[PDB]
């Protein structure tokens, strides 16, 4: 009945570090960060959660290299996270604390993976940045709500450039981990200061992926394109493309940084979409730590449909996305048609990034 599930999950918590493209706050690079002990447990819990949600519905008798496919973006902390989530599926306690080989870490890739990061890579997609800066009117109005807090942050960390919209978002996420992990030293980030920065971050990132057709295509179009490439085979009884386990592989788990959850949510919420039968606000949909998007494919006799379930963070209840004009279980061809507008192929995306 349930035949196949895609999961994309934000990676487990890692030692607070600066983002590439972010301001220098920690003076250590997040790309060098270990998962925290909490982050390893969170990643493992996700796999235990997913097994309980889906193992028996998918007809899987044993989670192993044939039955699930753990993938991740090209960052150690995301790759470690995805493999630990796999350990949770398998119920392999000791692999949670494994020091995964460089080899086991690289073996979490798939062909379209790196293209998913093109739109935020410096110099690689200038048209995406032109189109984000074109929304400066709305950005200024949003930032006007938190500019006092940004000024206090910049007072302590002068590298934060309020003129760079991503610096406000990336400073908030950096400070959020720092407050969690070192609370004694973080008493200056009060509840009101962080909640204020969080609102700015939510509104900026949601604007950056949904305000215009070009922002939606460039940030999320390749996600749709690869998903449909896969579902065109699954819906014919064939294996997910490139899945190591072939037809045996019933679950794909993709561990990412926050920006790809945001982009994936945006790609699944064209105008008129609902989350639990209500319009969404930027603040409510902002994917926190522990967030994941679940893409469930159903088959009733010969009829395939797709259901989209979103968990916005740790301990948050799942909510179901409904596309405009479709049901919770949206028949496959209608679902794909509903999402054609902002889908884009790799060849098209490279041209659209540069033209
Ligand atoms: C979530 C959509 C992006 C919002 C605006 C970003 C603007 C310009 C791109 C530069 C920022 C680099 C992001 C790095 C994020 C990461 O690696 O986790
Ligand atoms: N090949 C499918 C890549 C991909 C795109 N979006 C996804 C969401 C979840 C997932 O497991 C995977 C994906």
Numbering used by the authors: 2 to 356
The publication says:
Exploration of the salivary gland composition of the rat flea, Xenopsylla cheopis, revealed several abundant acid phosphatase-like proteins whose sequences lacked one or two of their presumed catalytic residues. Our data revealed that these flea salivary acid phosphatase-like proteins have lost their expected catalytic activity and, instead, have adopted a role as scavengers of biogenic amines and leukotrienes. Additionally, XcAP-1, XcAP-2, and XcAP-3 exhibit high affinity binding to biogenic amines and leukotrienes.
The three-dimensional structure model of XcAP-1 complexed with serotonin was determined using X-ray crystallography data at a resolution of 1.75 Å. The crystal belonged to the monoclinic space group P21, and the asymmetric unit contained two near-identical XcAP-1:serotonin complexes (r.m.s.d = 0.230 Å over 356 Cα positions). In the current structure model, the serotonin molecule was found within a pocket located in the α/β-domain. The entry to the binding pocket is formed by the side chains of XcAP-1 residues Phe111, Asp227 and Asp231. Notably, both Asp227 and Asp231 form salt bridges with the protonated aliphatic amino group of serotonin, contributing to its stabilization. At the bottom of the pocket, the serotonin hydroxyl group forms hydrogen bonds with both Val8 and Asn253, while the indole nitrogen interacts with the side chain of Gln256. In XcAP-1, the residues Met9, Leu228, and Gln265 show good shape complementary with the serotonin indole group, and the pocket is closed by the Val294 residue, providing support for the serotonin molecule. Interestingly, additional interpretable electron density near the putative catalytic site of XcAP-1 was also observed, in which we modeled a palmitoleic acid molecule. The carboxyl group of the fatty acid is well defined and is oriented towards the substituted catalytic residues, while the hydrocarbon chain extends into the interior of the pocket. The fatty acid’s binding mode is predominantly shaped by the side chains of hydrophobic residues, including Ala21, Gly22, Phe120, Ile121, Leu130, Leu133, Pro166, Trp170, Leu171, Ile205, Ala209, Phe260 and Ile263.
